[PDB]
């Protein structure tokens, strides 16, 4: 009999039952999408577009709804901080309910295809047996995919009929959904350019339409049909799985490294932005400008937006969480309340020392106050006996500008040490940890969870493609050898 891992092999030869189980899986996926969206709207707190955005709340499909245009909600609010006067029918809950009713209709269609499986459409009239013209089915599917891709690229993202996509400034401060003009030049192949998406989708849709028309028109050859077994369903299964984990690897890399399709204000910042000093660079540039024309360091730090200083915090690092540190970042290190201001450290003779920011690989880092010249001047010494760079010996005082603490100078070592420890993580923020009872360890971004899950699934589907391709080529010897 069929083993437990071979049960679905009952529907290899049945196209009607195959369509039924495809519809059942598709209904399950649509129902999950709707249920996940309702769950995330139920547990979603829109009470801070800036300091507690969706990626700080561990929202998974909320950025994907947001990226393609769904920004308003039936709850009477907008994620950008505005008020939804009339969100219409296409809100978050609207899309979820549409997915739920789609799942129900697909479940009914799956039941119908399970019952009425014996359709002569699945039987070729030349011999009466049940067979599928897989090259022609592929041509139809490729033609349909070309039309859908070209329509999505020429009507939705371009805004001539649709709403466009999520476009923002390079540092992810404002963010919105705009129609985007296609970039047909080499800059269209710029990954962070939003204009590549409409141009790519238009060109790929047109070429897919042409390839589908060609596949509808022209039959395969003897050599190709007997080599790749185009009359077999495991062959197309193997190759489809190959394309699927190819796309999974590509999109996992895109999510991890960042692109125009992965906005930072939706999926969190990237680890390379923290590693390469992106937000710290922009903050210090926006300080150097407007300190070069008056309004000195005592002021003008308020000209630094709180969102940028939040982006300059390693707690928003996607590669700083854990495998089993479950939940949102808010459940990890509290909810951000406000910016405490930039901490400037000075010794007794007046040199400006700065903390050595902890890298991504380290979870516990030694605190070192190092000067402009790059010479280690102070630290929180582990020894504290025959120690040469301790806080009270160097005489380090910490000051704050532009935050809740402004013009406040702290001199005592017990307070200077803890503010230096807070500054070791980047910009210093205060966190309410009593609302969700946070444990104190950093969590992972939705971007990080997406990339981890998709890479694991990509390797698993590499194995699946190997197994199915082996079964494809070696179908006749699957029960043993010929012994002759």
């Amino acid at each position: 009999g069929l083993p437990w891992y071979r049960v679905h092999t009952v529907v290899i030869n049945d196209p009607g039952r195959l369509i039924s189980v495809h519809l059942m899986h598709t209904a399950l996926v649509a129902g999950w999408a709707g249920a996940m969206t309702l769950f995330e709207i139920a547990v979603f707190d829109p009470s801070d577009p800036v300091l507690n955005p969706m990626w700080r709340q561990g929202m998974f499909v909320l950025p994907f709804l947001t990226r393609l245009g769904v920004t308003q909600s039936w709850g009477g609010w907008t994620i950008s901080g505005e008020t939804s006067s009339n969100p219409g029918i296409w809100s978050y809950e609207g899309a979820a309910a549409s997915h739920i009713v789609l799942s129900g209709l697909l479940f009914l269609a799956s039941v119908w295809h399970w019952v009425y499986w014996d359709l002569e459409l699945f039987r070729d009239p030349r011999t009466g047996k049940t067979a599928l013209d897989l090259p022609k089915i592929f041509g139809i599917h490729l033609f349909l995919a070309g039309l859908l891709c070209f329509g999505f690229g020429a009507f939705h993202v371009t805004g001539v009929f649709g709403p466009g996509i999520w476009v923002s400034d390079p540092y992810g401060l404002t963010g919105s959904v705009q129609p985007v003009a296609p970039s047909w030049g080499a800059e269209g192949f710029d990954p962070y350019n939003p204009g590549g998406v409409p141009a790519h989708h238009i060109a790929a849709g047109i070429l897919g339409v042409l390839a589908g028309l060609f596949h509808l028109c022209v039959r395969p050859s003897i050599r190709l049909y007997f080599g790749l077994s185009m009359g077999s369903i495991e062959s197309v299964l193997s190759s489809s799985i190959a394309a699927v984990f190819w796309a999974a690897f590509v999109v996992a890399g895109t999510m991890w490294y960042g692109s125009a399709a992965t906005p930072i204000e939706l999926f969190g910042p990237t680890r390379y932005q923290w590693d390469q000093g992106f937000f710290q660079q922009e903050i210090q540039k926006r300080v150097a400008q407007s300190t070069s024309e008056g309004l000195s360091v005592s002021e003008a730090w308020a000209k630094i937006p709180e969102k940028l200083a939040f982006y300059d915090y390693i707690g928003n690092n996607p590669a700083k969480g854990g495998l089993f540190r479950t939940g949102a970042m808010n459940s990890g290190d509290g909810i951000a309340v406000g910016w405490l201001g930039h901490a400037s450290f000075k010794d007794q003779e007046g040199r400006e020392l700065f903390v050595r920011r902890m890298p991504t690989f380290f979870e516990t880092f030694p605190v070192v106050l190092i000067d402009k010249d790059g010479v280690v001047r102070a630290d929180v010494p582990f020894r504290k006996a025959e120690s040469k760079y301790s806080i009270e010996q160097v005489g380090v005082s910490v000051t704050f500008y532009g935050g809740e603490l402004n013009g406040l100078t702290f001199t005592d070592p017990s307070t200077v040490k803890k503010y230096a420890r807070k500054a070791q993580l980047g910009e210093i923020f205060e966190f309410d940890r009593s609302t969700l009872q946070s444990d104190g360890v950093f969590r992972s971004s939705p971007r990080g969870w997406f990339t981890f899950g998709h890479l694991s699934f990509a390797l698993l589907f590499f194995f699946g493609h190997i197994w199915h391709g082996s079964r494809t080529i070696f179908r006749d010897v699957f029960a043993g050898i010929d012994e002759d």
């Binding site: 459409l121 699945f122 599928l132 013209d133 022609k136 192949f189 022209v218 003897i222 992106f278």
Partner: protein, 67 residues
């Protein structure tokens, strides 16, 4: 014995009729070679642009590309 006859099945019938009807010889496998090698070239071009192993006049390959 024929299956369950339906108007939709009769409409989509010629779309699934020639199961096993192929071309003689190798067909368009020279066109396979041409298309697959150009796709590999284009894919490599994309990889070098995104890996910064190829620098163009108009691309930046960074977040300031949003500027």
């Amino acid at each position: 014995e024929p299956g369950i006859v339906t108007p939709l099945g009769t409409l989509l019938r010629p779309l699934n009729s020639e199961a096993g009807k192929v071309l003689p010889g190798w067909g368009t496998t020279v066109l396979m070679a041409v298309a697959i090698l150009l796709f590999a070239v284009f894919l490599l071009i994309i990889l070098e642009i995104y890996n910064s192993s190829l620098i163009l006049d108009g691309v930046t390959n960074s977040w300031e590309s949003l500027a």
